[PDB]
Amino acid sequence: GLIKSLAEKEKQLLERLEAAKKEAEERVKRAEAEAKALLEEAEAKAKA
Amino acid sequence: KLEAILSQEVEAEIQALLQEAEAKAEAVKREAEEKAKALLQARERALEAQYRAALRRAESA
């Protein structure tokens, strides 16, 4: 006599999991972006 | 109480992921640094050759 417990709890724990995956990706990216920018410096030196 | 268990179980996987996803963000930085070193160590060496040749030529000349 109250489906709001299991219904509306699933849709917050599942949404909290997605936000975990986002800042998992949107941070692991940053490391790959940092890498690009490093190997640019790795030329700026070589040409210098 | 149970449920607060289920919520103490998620905030746990969602550090496992965030631990896995910042133990690659180094691996990317390691292999990128171990790249750049080697991408400039061969270059260092190349200039010697291109200079060892150029000065010898200029000795003979």
Side-chain angles (χ1 to χ4, degrees), chain A residues 1 5 7 10 12-24 26 28-46 48, chain B residues 2-7 9-23 25-28 30-34 36-44 46-49 51-61:
Chain A
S5 67
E10 178 183 352
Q12 318 189 26
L13 297 171
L14 208 152
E15 285 191 48
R16 185 147 206 261
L17 285 161
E18 277 192 312
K21 303 268 187 193
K22 264 150 173 161
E23 209 178 312
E26 205 145 42
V28 72
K29 272 165 42 177
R30 267 172 269 170
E32 287 172 321
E34 232 161 27
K36 170 170 188 280
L38 191 67
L39 303 190
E40 277 206 329
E41 188 76 61
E43 270 304 299
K45 170 53 168 183
Chain B
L2 294 174
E3 175 178 3
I5 290 297
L6 182 50
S7 292
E9 283 271 36
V10 303
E11 172 69 10
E13 188 105 56
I14 88 192
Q15 262 79 57
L17 303 188
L18 301 183
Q19 277 178 32
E20 195 185 39
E22 211 61 26
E26 48 142 27
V28 166
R30 291 310 216 107
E31 168 253 56
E33 278 186 334
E34 279 101 73
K37 171 205 185 79
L39 191 278
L40 211 155
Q41 272 288 322
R43 196 78 99 77
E44 282 161 34
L47 303 195
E48 286 314 271
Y51 176 95
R52 291 300 160 220
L55 270 200
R56 269 181 46 201
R57 195 71 177 177
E59 286 169 46
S60 294

